[PDB]
Each structure stands twice: as C-alpha cells, then as structure tokens.
mmCIF file of C-alpha atoms and ligand atoms in Angstrom:
data_model
loop_
_atom_site.group_PDB
_atom_site.id
_atom_site.type_symbol
_atom_site.label_atom_id
_atom_site.label_comp_id
_atom_site.label_asym_id
_atom_site.label_seq_id
_atom_site.Cartn_x
_atom_site.Cartn_y
_atom_site.Cartn_z
ATOM 1 C CA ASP A 2 0.141 -0.228 0.351
ATOM 2 C CA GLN A 3 1.645 3.237 -1.153
ATOM 3 C CA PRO A 4 1.313 6.650 0.000
ATOM 4 C CA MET A 5 -0.706 9.323 -2.712
ATOM 5 C CA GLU A 6 1.795 12.179 -1.492
ATOM 6 C CA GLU A 7 4.967 11.692 0.511
ATOM 7 C CA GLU A 8 7.293 14.710 0.657
ATOM 8 C CA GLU A 9 10.409 15.464 3.014
ATOM 9 C CA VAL A 10 9.522 18.428 5.664
ATOM 10 C CA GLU A 11 12.359 20.366 6.968
ATOM 11 C CA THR A 12 11.903 22.058 10.864
ATOM 12 C CA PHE A 13 14.517 25.383 11.240
ATOM 13 C CA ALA A 14 14.758 27.367 14.920
ATOM 14 C CA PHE A 15 14.878 30.901 14.022
ATOM 15 C CA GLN A 16 17.406 33.114 14.806
ATOM 16 C CA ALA A 17 17.263 33.713 18.882
ATOM 17 C CA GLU A 18 16.486 37.783 17.935
ATOM 18 C CA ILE A 19 14.297 36.712 15.617
ATOM 19 C CA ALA A 20 12.109 34.297 17.774
ATOM 20 C CA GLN A 21 11.997 37.428 20.473
ATOM 21 C CA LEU A 22 10.576 39.206 18.142
ATOM 22 C CA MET A 23 7.668 37.112 16.940
ATOM 23 C CA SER A 24 7.262 36.303 20.387
ATOM 24 C CA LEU A 25 6.630 40.181 21.293
ATOM 25 C CA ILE A 26 4.219 40.995 18.174
ATOM 26 C CA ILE A 27 2.344 38.049 18.411
ATOM 27 C CA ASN A 28 1.650 37.970 22.308
ATOM 28 C CA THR A 29 2.094 41.535 23.250
ATOM 29 C CA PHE A 30 -1.687 44.123 22.482
ATOM 30 C CA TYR A 31 -1.420 47.129 20.189
ATOM 31 C CA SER A 32 -3.939 49.424 18.708
ATOM 32 C CA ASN A 33 -3.153 49.571 14.917
ATOM 33 C CA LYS A 34 -2.917 45.903 13.568
ATOM 34 C CA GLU A 35 -3.841 46.749 10.214
ATOM 35 C CA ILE A 36 -0.492 47.640 9.440
ATOM 36 C CA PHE A 37 -0.066 44.098 8.534
ATOM 37 C CA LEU A 38 -1.541 44.749 5.208
ATOM 38 C CA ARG A 39 0.831 47.502 4.644
ATOM 39 C CA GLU A 40 3.745 45.645 5.676
ATOM 40 C CA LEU A 41 3.020 42.746 3.373
ATOM 41 C CA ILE A 42 2.206 45.099 0.731
ATOM 42 C CA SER A 43 5.589 46.970 0.462
ATOM 43 C CA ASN A 44 7.273 43.657 0.382
ATOM 44 C CA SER A 45 4.848 42.942 -2.905
ATOM 45 C CA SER A 46 5.701 45.754 -4.269
ATOM 46 C CA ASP A 47 9.159 45.517 -3.583
ATOM 47 C CA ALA A 48 9.239 42.475 -5.143
ATOM 48 C CA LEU A 49 6.792 43.267 -8.491
ATOM 49 C CA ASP A 50 10.326 46.102 -8.333
ATOM 50 C CA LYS A 51 13.179 43.701 -7.790
ATOM 51 C CA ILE A 52 11.442 41.360 -11.015
ATOM 52 C CA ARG A 53 11.070 44.450 -13.465
ATOM 53 C CA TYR A 54 14.297 46.067 -12.855
ATOM 54 C CA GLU A 55 15.990 41.690 -14.171
ATOM 55 C CA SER A 56 13.216 42.441 -17.457
ATOM 56 C CA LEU A 57 14.413 45.627 -18.415
ATOM 57 C CA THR A 58 17.375 43.550 -18.894
ATOM 58 C CA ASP A 59 16.940 40.568 -19.288
ATOM 59 C CA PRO A 60 12.601 39.956 -21.068
ATOM 60 C CA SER A 61 13.176 36.751 -20.697
ATOM 61 C CA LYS A 62 13.060 36.979 -17.461
ATOM 62 C CA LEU A 63 9.046 37.409 -17.562
ATOM 63 C CA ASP A 64 8.603 33.730 -19.907
ATOM 64 C CA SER A 65 6.890 32.920 -16.144
ATOM 65 C CA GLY A 66 4.553 35.786 -16.859
ATOM 66 C CA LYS A 67 4.260 39.254 -17.436
ATOM 67 C CA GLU A 68 1.580 40.966 -15.318
ATOM 68 C CA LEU A 69 2.633 42.968 -12.380
ATOM 69 C CA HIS A 70 -0.023 42.879 -9.672
ATOM 70 C CA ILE A 71 -0.955 42.031 -6.153
ATOM 71 C CA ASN A 72 -4.360 40.375 -5.495
ATOM 72 C CA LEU A 73 -5.885 40.008 -1.942
ATOM 73 C CA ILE A 74 -7.654 37.207 -1.023
ATOM 74 C CA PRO A 75 -9.951 36.827 1.899
ATOM 75 C CA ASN A 76 -11.269 33.631 2.297
ATOM 76 C CA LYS A 77 -14.102 33.780 5.571
ATOM 77 C CA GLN A 78 -14.386 29.531 5.316
ATOM 78 C CA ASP A 79 -10.870 29.669 5.976
ATOM 79 C CA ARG A 80 -10.681 31.643 8.391
ATOM 80 C CA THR A 81 -7.180 32.995 5.825
ATOM 81 C CA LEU A 82 -5.799 36.323 4.005
ATOM 82 C CA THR A 83 -3.746 35.474 1.603
ATOM 83 C CA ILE A 84 -1.725 38.597 -0.327
ATOM 84 C CA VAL A 85 -0.567 36.918 -3.888
ATOM 85 C CA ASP A 86 2.121 38.523 -5.964
ATOM 86 C CA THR A 87 4.420 38.276 -9.774
ATOM 87 C CA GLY A 88 7.207 39.356 -7.959
ATOM 88 C CA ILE A 89 10.632 37.346 -7.499
ATOM 89 C CA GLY A 90 9.215 35.205 -5.708
ATOM 90 C CA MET A 91 12.613 33.084 -3.464
ATOM 91 C CA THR A 92 14.513 30.193 -3.916
ATOM 92 C CA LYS A 93 14.896 27.736 -0.790
ATOM 93 C CA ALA A 94 17.516 29.162 0.264
ATOM 94 C CA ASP A 95 15.991 32.370 0.087
ATOM 95 C CA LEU A 96 12.958 30.914 2.272
ATOM 96 C CA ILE A 97 15.650 29.383 5.373
ATOM 97 C CA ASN A 98 17.866 32.272 4.798
ATOM 98 C CA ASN A 99 15.215 35.352 4.592
ATOM 99 C CA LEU A 100 12.609 33.899 6.483
ATOM 100 C CA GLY A 101 13.886 33.109 9.830
ATOM 101 C CA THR A 102 17.698 31.495 9.673
ATOM 102 C CA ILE A 103 19.841 34.564 9.266
ATOM 103 C CA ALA A 104 19.878 37.502 11.770
ATOM 104 C CA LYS A 105 19.097 41.675 10.533
ATOM 105 C CA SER A 106 20.572 43.846 11.686
ATOM 106 C CA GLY A 107 16.869 45.892 12.006
ATOM 107 C CA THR A 108 15.632 42.583 14.681
ATOM 108 C CA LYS A 109 17.301 43.790 17.836
ATOM 109 C CA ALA A 110 17.408 47.343 16.822
ATOM 110 C CA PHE A 111 14.458 47.351 16.381
ATOM 111 C CA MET A 112 13.179 46.110 19.245
ATOM 112 C CA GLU A 113 15.274 48.507 21.480
ATOM 113 C CA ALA A 114 13.742 51.285 19.569
ATOM 114 C CA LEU A 115 10.268 49.857 21.062
ATOM 115 C CA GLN A 116 11.253 50.119 24.496
ATOM 116 C CA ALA A 117 12.895 53.668 23.519
ATOM 117 C CA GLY A 118 9.705 54.487 22.958
ATOM 118 C CA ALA A 119 9.590 54.081 19.352
ATOM 119 C CA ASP A 120 5.950 53.101 17.431
ATOM 120 C CA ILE A 121 5.472 48.786 16.263
ATOM 121 C CA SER A 122 3.812 50.525 12.849
ATOM 122 C CA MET A 123 7.624 51.935 12.029
ATOM 123 C CA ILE A 124 8.715 47.754 12.254
ATOM 124 C CA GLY A 125 8.765 48.088 7.936
ATOM 125 C CA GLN A 126 12.122 50.940 8.605
ATOM 126 C CA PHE A 127 14.030 47.995 10.067
ATOM 127 C CA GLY A 128 13.287 45.969 7.133
ATOM 128 C CA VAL A 129 11.189 43.543 9.355
ATOM 129 C CA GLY A 130 7.765 44.475 8.447
ATOM 130 C CA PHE A 131 7.001 40.464 7.541
ATOM 131 C CA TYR A 132 6.289 39.753 11.535
ATOM 132 C CA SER A 133 3.259 41.928 11.562
ATOM 133 C CA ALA A 134 1.552 39.249 9.877
ATOM 134 C CA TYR A 135 1.453 37.729 14.050
ATOM 135 C CA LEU A 136 -0.614 40.683 14.611
ATOM 136 C CA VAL A 137 -3.157 39.412 13.106
ATOM 137 C CA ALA A 138 -2.139 35.774 12.586
ATOM 138 C CA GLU A 139 -2.553 32.524 14.614
ATOM 139 C CA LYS A 140 0.120 30.762 11.451
ATOM 140 C CA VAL A 141 1.016 31.973 8.180
ATOM 141 C CA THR A 142 1.878 30.447 4.653
ATOM 142 C CA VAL A 143 4.220 31.557 2.299
ATOM 143 C CA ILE A 144 4.198 29.679 -0.793
ATOM 144 C CA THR A 145 6.666 31.055 -3.583
ATOM 145 C CA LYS A 146 8.159 30.210 -6.473
ATOM 146 C CA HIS A 147 11.198 31.637 -7.811
ATOM 147 C CA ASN A 148 12.177 31.744 -11.664
ATOM 148 C CA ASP A 149 14.335 28.158 -12.572
ATOM 149 C CA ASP A 150 13.371 26.989 -8.562
ATOM 150 C CA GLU A 151 10.097 24.768 -7.943
ATOM 151 C CA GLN A 152 8.046 25.603 -5.665
ATOM 152 C CA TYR A 153 8.011 25.844 -2.085
ATOM 153 C CA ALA A 154 6.218 26.552 0.809
ATOM 154 C CA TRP A 155 7.451 27.735 4.460
ATOM 155 C CA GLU A 156 5.300 27.973 7.560
ATOM 156 C CA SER A 157 5.487 28.633 11.344
ATOM 157 C CA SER A 158 3.214 29.503 14.283
ATOM 158 C CA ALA A 159 5.761 31.028 15.516
ATOM 159 C CA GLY A 160 7.201 28.923 18.576
ATOM 160 C CA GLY A 161 10.641 29.290 17.661
ATOM 161 C CA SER A 162 10.571 27.606 14.234
ATOM 162 C CA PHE A 163 9.268 27.209 10.744
ATOM 163 C CA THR A 164 8.875 24.640 8.249
ATOM 164 C CA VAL A 165 10.488 24.369 4.729
ATOM 165 C CA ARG A 166 8.388 21.804 2.083
ATOM 166 C CA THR A 167 8.128 21.103 -1.895
ATOM 167 C CA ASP A 168 4.437 22.941 -2.530
ATOM 168 C CA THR A 169 2.843 20.274 -4.788
ATOM 169 C CA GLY A 170 -0.727 21.918 -4.785
ATOM 170 C CA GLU A 171 -1.834 24.681 -7.363
ATOM 171 C CA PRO A 172 1.650 25.523 -9.541
ATOM 172 C CA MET A 173 1.808 29.690 -9.972
ATOM 173 C CA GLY A 174 3.804 31.247 -12.477
ATOM 174 C CA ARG A 175 5.559 33.520 -10.484
ATOM 175 C CA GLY A 176 6.227 35.006 -7.475
ATOM 176 C CA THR A 177 4.546 34.601 -3.591
ATOM 177 C CA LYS A 178 1.581 33.728 -1.537
ATOM 178 C CA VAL A 179 1.351 34.766 1.818
ATOM 179 C CA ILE A 180 -1.265 33.597 3.295
ATOM 180 C CA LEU A 181 -1.786 34.456 7.213
ATOM 181 C CA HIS A 182 -4.827 32.045 9.213
ATOM 182 C CA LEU A 183 -6.301 34.506 11.570
ATOM 183 C CA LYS A 184 -6.502 34.885 14.767
ATOM 184 C CA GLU A 185 -9.920 34.277 16.071
ATOM 185 C CA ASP A 186 -10.703 37.587 17.035
ATOM 186 C CA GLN A 187 -9.543 39.353 13.966
ATOM 187 C CA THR A 188 -11.695 38.446 11.084
ATOM 188 C CA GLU A 189 -12.427 42.000 10.956
ATOM 189 C CA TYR A 190 -9.473 41.717 8.535
ATOM 190 C CA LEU A 191 -11.768 39.597 6.304
ATOM 191 C CA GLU A 192 -14.056 42.404 5.145
ATOM 192 C CA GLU A 193 -15.095 44.195 2.286
ATOM 193 C CA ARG A 194 -14.714 47.385 3.639
ATOM 194 C CA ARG A 195 -12.225 46.558 6.357
ATOM 195 C CA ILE A 196 -9.565 45.929 3.800
ATOM 196 C CA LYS A 197 -10.379 48.153 1.168
ATOM 197 C CA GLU A 198 -10.228 51.567 3.419
ATOM 198 C CA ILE A 199 -6.615 50.062 4.809
ATOM 199 C CA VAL A 200 -5.816 49.334 1.318
ATOM 200 C CA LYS A 201 -7.015 53.379 0.599
ATOM 201 C CA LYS A 202 -5.417 54.480 4.004
ATOM 202 C CA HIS A 203 -1.962 52.681 4.154
ATOM 203 C CA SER A 204 -1.096 52.032 0.585
ATOM 204 C CA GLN A 205 -2.175 54.684 -1.792
ATOM 205 C CA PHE A 206 1.258 55.130 -3.295
ATOM 206 C CA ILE A 207 1.691 50.503 -4.508
ATOM 207 C CA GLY A 208 2.219 51.374 -8.087
ATOM 208 C CA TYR A 209 0.495 47.838 -8.846
ATOM 209 C CA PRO A 210 -2.687 47.677 -9.232
ATOM 210 C CA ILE A 211 -4.460 45.876 -6.490
ATOM 211 C CA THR A 212 -7.541 43.227 -6.612
ATOM 212 C CA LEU A 213 -9.352 41.707 -4.019
ATOM 213 C CA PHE A 214 -10.655 38.181 -5.053
ATOM 214 C CA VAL A 215 -13.715 36.727 -2.465
ATOM 215 C CA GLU A 216 -12.841 33.287 -2.188
ATOM 216 C CA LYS A 217 -16.163 30.949 -1.147
ATOM 217 C CA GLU A 218 -15.983 27.319 -1.086
ATOM 218 C CA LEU A 219 -19.795 26.639 -2.635
ATOM 219 C CA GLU A 220 -22.447 24.396 -0.777
ATOM 220 C CA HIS A 221 -21.255 20.722 -0.923
ATOM 221 C CA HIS A 222 -18.238 21.547 -2.953
ATOM 222 C CA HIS A 223 -15.467 22.394 -0.067
HETATM 223 C C1 FU7 B 301 17.130 38.088 -4.269
HETATM 224 C C2 FU7 B 301 15.466 38.314 -3.861
HETATM 225 F F1 FU7 B 301 14.734 39.143 -4.941
HETATM 226 F F2 FU7 B 301 15.641 38.630 -3.220
HETATM 227 C C3 FU7 B 301 14.258 37.626 -3.194
HETATM 228 N N1 FU7 B 301 13.291 36.984 -2.826
HETATM 229 C C4 FU7 B 301 12.769 37.693 -1.671
HETATM 230 O O1 FU7 B 301 13.760 37.678 -0.593
HETATM 231 N N2 FU7 B 301 11.230 37.695 -0.780
HETATM 232 C C5 FU7 B 301 10.576 37.410 -2.611
HETATM 233 C C6 FU7 B 301 9.855 38.344 -1.841
HETATM 234 N N3 FU7 B 301 8.474 38.919 -1.795
HETATM 235 C C7 FU7 B 301 6.628 38.532 -0.871
HETATM 236 N N4 FU7 B 301 5.948 39.031 -1.310
HETATM 237 N N5 FU7 B 301 7.316 38.759 0.706
HETATM 238 C C8 FU7 B 301 8.899 39.362 1.016
HETATM 239 C C9 FU7 B 301 8.965 38.694 1.746
HETATM 240 C C10 FU7 B 301 9.405 37.745 3.290
HETATM 241 CL CL1 FU7 B 301 7.780 36.301 2.497
HETATM 242 C C11 FU7 B 301 9.011 37.110 4.918
HETATM 243 C C12 FU7 B 301 10.087 38.404 4.669
HETATM 244 CL CL2 FU7 B 301 10.486 38.258 6.184
HETATM 245 C C13 FU7 B 301 10.664 39.040 4.267
HETATM 246 C C14 FU7 B 301 10.294 40.101 2.057
HETATM 247 O O2 FU7 B 301 10.527 40.440 1.545
HETATM 248 C C15 FU7 B 301 10.960 41.643 2.611
HETATM 249 C C16 FU7 B 301 11.677 42.171 0.689
HETATM 250 N N6 FU7 B 301 11.973 42.594 -0.599
HETATM 251 C C17 FU7 B 301 11.076 42.149 -1.004
HETATM 252 C C18 FU7 B 301 10.975 41.631 -2.876
HETATM 253 C C19 FU7 B 301 12.845 41.131 -1.758
HETATM 254 N N7 FU7 B 301 13.208 41.350 -0.878
HETATM 255 C C20 FU7 B 301 9.444 38.466 -0.031
HETATM 256 C C21 FU7 B 301 11.554 38.217 -0.086
#
C-alpha cells in the first residue's frame, strides 16, 4: 500500500532575536494592528520592483508571466487572508535565509527602538515588517516560486521554529503568496469594507494593480 504523496519536511530554528521579536508581536496588545497589510503589500511591491528591474535587461525573465500585480484574497470559511504577488519570488535558500535563520541588524534595532518608545508601525523601517503578520495571524504560510526553481512552502506558528517543504498544490507562474491564518478575534480583516479602507488609507502610493478576490467554496464543494 503506497502513499498518494510523500515529501520531505525540514524544520529550522529561528535565530534568537527573530524568535524574540515574534514572541513580542504575537503576544502583545497593540491598537493599530491593521498595519500588517501595508507591510505585506510593501514587500510585494518591492518583489515586483525586483523582477521588473531584471526584465529591463532580460525580457525572458517574464516568460513565467508578464503581469505585475498584487491580489488580496479573503476566505471566511478557512479564516485566511492571502496576499499574492507575481514578484521575483524566492529560492529554497532564500526562504531559509530570509525568513528566520539569519539575523538582520534591524531585528534587535527594532526591539531596542520599541523599548526606547518607538511605535510598532515603524517596523518596516527596520526591514522586518513581514513579522507584523503575527499581529493578526496565529500561523503564516508562505508559498513562493522563483524563476528556474521549484515551488516551496514555508510555515510557522511561531514558538521558535518554522518548516520548509516543496509545494505540490496549484502551481504558480512566479511570485509569492502569504497566507494568514487569522486569530479568532481578528476576522474583521476578512470583510470587504475593512480591507478596502485599509488599502485606501495605507497603500495609496503602490504602483501596481491591487485586486480583491473574495473567495467562497460553494456548498458541498469545499
Ligand atoms: C533575491 C530576492 F529577490 F530578494 C529574493 N526574494 C526575496 O527574498 N523575497 C521576495 C518576497 N516577496 C514577498 N511578497 N515577500 C517577501 C518577504 C517575506 Cl515572505 C518574508 C520576509 Cl521576513 C521578508 C520579505 O520581503 C522583504 C523585502 N523584499 C521584497 C523582495 C525582496 N526583499 C519576499 C522576499
């Protein structure tokens, strides 16, 4: 009797300061949590800038898809909010290096700044805005696809470690999906009016199309 699927899953420990930051963010009360969406859309914009720049000199970099955009996908049934871009994406090494194992100077800098009276909303200025996702999410899953490379899934519920594995689900052309599994009391960010007002207020100057796709599994077909 053979398995439908088998795949290797790697578990990595977060660098100590990153673990520290994630604990502070996911546990502490803050009154301006909506800033997470600005930070993720900002990361997507940056990733789109990168692939765009590459395509300036090598058009073939867009063979995996010419459209440069950001999609926002609330799914009330799964209690997930997903931010999708067709930006540059990440290799497996990028995931492991950039999402937890290597310490950035801005990680301790940001926590120092907060203790010195700075606001959480400055997190992006320290290059660690992604982790603001844990203001509203109990678990974050990142699915990513870089040119020439396989599609990978990174995941963490915090608590000191993350996992990486190959993603065999629906193949992306190129880019990154950040899937926020929301905290029970944070479901307001699945509502259309809330998403719209947050994008309007905080992401006004993003130079790529941002599109809402409200997702619902139709009855008996979940
Ligand atoms: C060489 C490379 F092009 F740079 C590899 N490409 C990446 O490293 N990324 C592509 C990407 N796309 C989205 N939508 N988000 C993230 C992102 C995530 Cl998921 C987690 C953290 Cl901690 C930081 C992040 O971006 C920080 C800011 N940045 C955006 C692009 C690059 N740096 C990344 C990282």
